[PDB]
């Protein structure tokens, strides 16, 4: 146990701030809302962009999934859920399916492309606690993290857990998939993040030193780093190879924790939603707050950066989405 | 939008919006309640009499008023995370088995945790105390000293007088926690037998009082 910490301390040749102290910082990045997506009844708990960078599905606590046309503000789909409380939603990389999960211990997979409307294609059951995050690997398998301190790789065609990932002591709140889609990370309320190998089905690395429960996680676009956000009003950036944290994004002014963390296409911008009604944009290499996305009347709950990186969508508890660009 | 296909997409979106408007009309005219308790309590009996899954939702209508009641099922002991989902509910019906004499302290700790929750401020709690008849034969039959578990029972004053004394001792022990803190939310104790049909009526009355007091505070008339 202490050997790993000693090795991590030894491997820390220098802080990333010193290396990136001489670089030219980016200026005040001003982003204005170009579209407002409204129609949700209750607070919005999750959203996910499409790979086409135009469609996005959002989940509301009223028991509703909405698939929007972000370019034209049109509502492509409105799926009524069987359970009112949903805390996560995912959009398939091919766009043929959408997933959701919530207080019920069920992952609902809906088939968008039907000869019929939208029908629930699968109801994955087997988790003991509430689902907090679900992400599609492809049209056949999905990784879902739940409230019983476990993650699970499922087989949608079969409906049974192909693999289970255990080791977290607190319930898992969010997960993110690597661009290679061969391994992922999961942040739990155990104040730690764990790296899971999808094929091996076992934990590979553990990242600690993040004071409160981790509320959000995302990969750096390179895939060798990932940023976490928790409830102690700080964001961490861990590097997979160094097996430690690189920099810390926090301010003395910020008191409330982070709900969602996302990266830009090039990784130069880290967008973090906060409980203080708005989102902060940070220079990911210098930890300087360059840009604030204000305009939400309630706590921000979900963020998303498109694959092409042109726009960033923010959903919060005022039942409104905003497309900043 | 100028194109024909885009116009048809816009009209489909408008139909979606009309459906969402009807759903909002239904959603505003209903009251959401969170049912909490323990395995030893009679929450399942209460929901059955009134009307690996992680939640069970119950619809009950009284005086043409609709009440959703959400009871979390298979969930871990820690609840500090999903409770954030219930910061906009009308009330929290907390059910306690009064005849256990052993899990009573656990129920008190749970009620203290719920009452002082940061996200549950301005959310009122309705205390249901089941097993009142079971409490009655337990008190009258002896062999289970109430003062043994709670040393302050002997130095306390208000069917048989002993049953009423025990009932009101439990009620006061529950309400001391609510009166210790809070002005934004209130506790509504009740006594419920094994099978009673007045649970929905008293839930309706407590919800009416809760919303009335919230409106009075909103306009500053309290």
């Amino acid at each position: 146990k202490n050997q790993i910490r000693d090795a991590r301390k030894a491997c820390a040749d220098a802080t990333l701030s010193q290396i990136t102290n001489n670089i030219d910082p980016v200026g005040r990045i001003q982003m204005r809302t170009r579209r407002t997506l409204r129609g949700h009844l209750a607070k919005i708990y999750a959203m996910h962009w499409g790979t086409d960078s135009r469609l996005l599905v959002s989940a509301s606590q009223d028991g509703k999934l909405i698939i929007w046309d972000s370019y034209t503000t049109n509502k492509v789909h409105a799926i009524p859920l069987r359970s009112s409380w949903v805390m996560t939603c995912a959009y398939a990389p091919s766009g043929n399916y959408v997933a959701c999960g919530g207080l019920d211990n069920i992952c609902s997979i809906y088939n968008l492309k039907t000869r019929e409307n939208v029908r629930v294609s699968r109801e994955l059951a087997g988790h003991t606690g509430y689902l907090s995050c679900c992400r599609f690997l492809d049209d056949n398998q999905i990784v879902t993290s739940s409230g019983d301190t476990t993650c699970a790789l499922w087989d949608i065609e079969t409906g049974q857990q192909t693999t289970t990932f255990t080791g977290h002591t607190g319930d898992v709140m969010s997960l993110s998939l690597a661009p290679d889609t061969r391994l992922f990370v999961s942040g739990a309320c155990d104040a730690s993040a764990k790296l899971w190998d999808v094929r091996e089905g076992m934990c590979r690395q553990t990242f600690t030193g993040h004071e409160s429960d981790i509320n959000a996680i995302c990969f750096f676009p390179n895939g060798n780093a990932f940023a976490t956000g928790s409830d102690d009003a700080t964001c961490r950036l861990f590097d997979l190879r160094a097996d430690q944290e690189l920099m810390t994004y926090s301010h003395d002014n910020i008191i409330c924790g982070i709900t969602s963390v996302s990266f830009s296409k090039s990784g130069r911008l880290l967008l973090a939603g906060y409980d203080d009604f708005n989102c902060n944009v940070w220079d990911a290499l210098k930890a300087d707050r360059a840009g604030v996305l204000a305009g939400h009347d309630n706590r921000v709950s979900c963020l998303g950066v498109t694959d092409d990186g042109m726009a960033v969508a923010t959903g919060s508890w005022d039942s409104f989405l905003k497309i900043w660009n | 939008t100028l194109s024909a296909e885009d116009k048809a997409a816009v009209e489909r979106s408008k139909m979606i919006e009309k459906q969402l408007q009807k759903d909002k009309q239904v959603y505003r005219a209903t009251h959401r309640l969170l049912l909490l308790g323990a395995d030893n309590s009679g929450k399942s009996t209460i929901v059955k009499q009134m009307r690996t899954s992680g939640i069970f939702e119950t619809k009950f209508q009284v005086d043409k008023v609709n009440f959703h009641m959400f009871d979390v099922g298979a969930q871990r002991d820690e609840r500090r995370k999903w409770i954030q989902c219930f910061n906009d509910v009308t009330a929290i019906i907390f059910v306690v088995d009064s005849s256990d004499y052993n899990r009573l302290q656990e129920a008190l700790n749970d009620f203290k945790s719920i009452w002082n929750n940061r996200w549950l401020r301005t959310i009122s709690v309705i205390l249901f105390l089941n097993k009142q008849d079971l409490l009655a034969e337990k008190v009258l039959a002896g062999k289970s000293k109430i003062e043994d578990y709670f040393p302050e029972f002997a130095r306390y004053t208000t069917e048989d007088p002993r049953v009423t004394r025990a009932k009101y001792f439990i009620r006061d022990e529950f309400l001391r926690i609510s009166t210790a803190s809070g002005g934004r939310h209130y506790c509504y104790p009740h006594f419920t037998c094994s099978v009673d049909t007045e649970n929905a009526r008293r839930i309706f009355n407590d919800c009416r009082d809760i919303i009335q007091r919230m409106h009075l505070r909103q306009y500053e008339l309290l």
């Epitope: 469609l55 049109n74 019929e116 | 194109s3 024909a4 885009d6 009209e11």
Partner: single-chain antibody, 229 residues
Framework: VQLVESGGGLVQPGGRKLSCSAS????????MHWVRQAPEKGLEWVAY????????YYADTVKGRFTISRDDPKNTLFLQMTSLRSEDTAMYYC??????????????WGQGTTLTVADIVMTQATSSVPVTPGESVSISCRSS???????????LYWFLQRPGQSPQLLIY???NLASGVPDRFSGSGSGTAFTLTISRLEAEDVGVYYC?????????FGAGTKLEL
Amino acid sequence: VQLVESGGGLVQPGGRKLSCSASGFAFSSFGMHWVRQAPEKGLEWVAYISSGSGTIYYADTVKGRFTISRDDPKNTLFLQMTSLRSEDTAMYYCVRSIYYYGSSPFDFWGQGTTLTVADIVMTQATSSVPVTPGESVSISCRSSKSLLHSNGNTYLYWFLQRPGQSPQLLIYRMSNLASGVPDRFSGSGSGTAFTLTISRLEAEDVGVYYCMQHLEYPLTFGAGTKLEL
């Protein structure tokens, strides 16, 4: 999914109602079309009714002569014919459609029922291409104006009608195959000139090929090329 039609027959000039009953899909969520096909001509768009009946569009030739309606609870579509003329003696097809981002309109067609008594123009230069199985086949078409809109989508649809049965959608917007069509059909264009090519050639590919523009609702189908064996 199924859309089966009823009605039609022999009528004196100047006089029916055609019904289209659906079974196998959410009829209320799909817009509906009535499309004609004369024995001596090709396909001809007749009428369109939206999902919620909010917008209804009619053929330029017949506007007050025909009326269209639907009932979702019965999942049925009605076309009432008034003042039937000699030209209104074509086959009538009840075509399913749906319009959202990424949808595939005109995907399913009914079998149809026999009946006997400023818009843009698209002409297919060839009437019939003689080819042999196993060889790539090219079918060309043209439009009176640039068919590509400002959205970047070109609203052109390619249908194949195999002899003895109803047409079935092949291509929509020149870059999207239909649901179950073989992966040997493809489309290309530049706004005015349009071309569908088949790399292989099978026995089932024989039929009549039609091109339609959906940029504007008065729908200009094409002449159609007969793919003779």
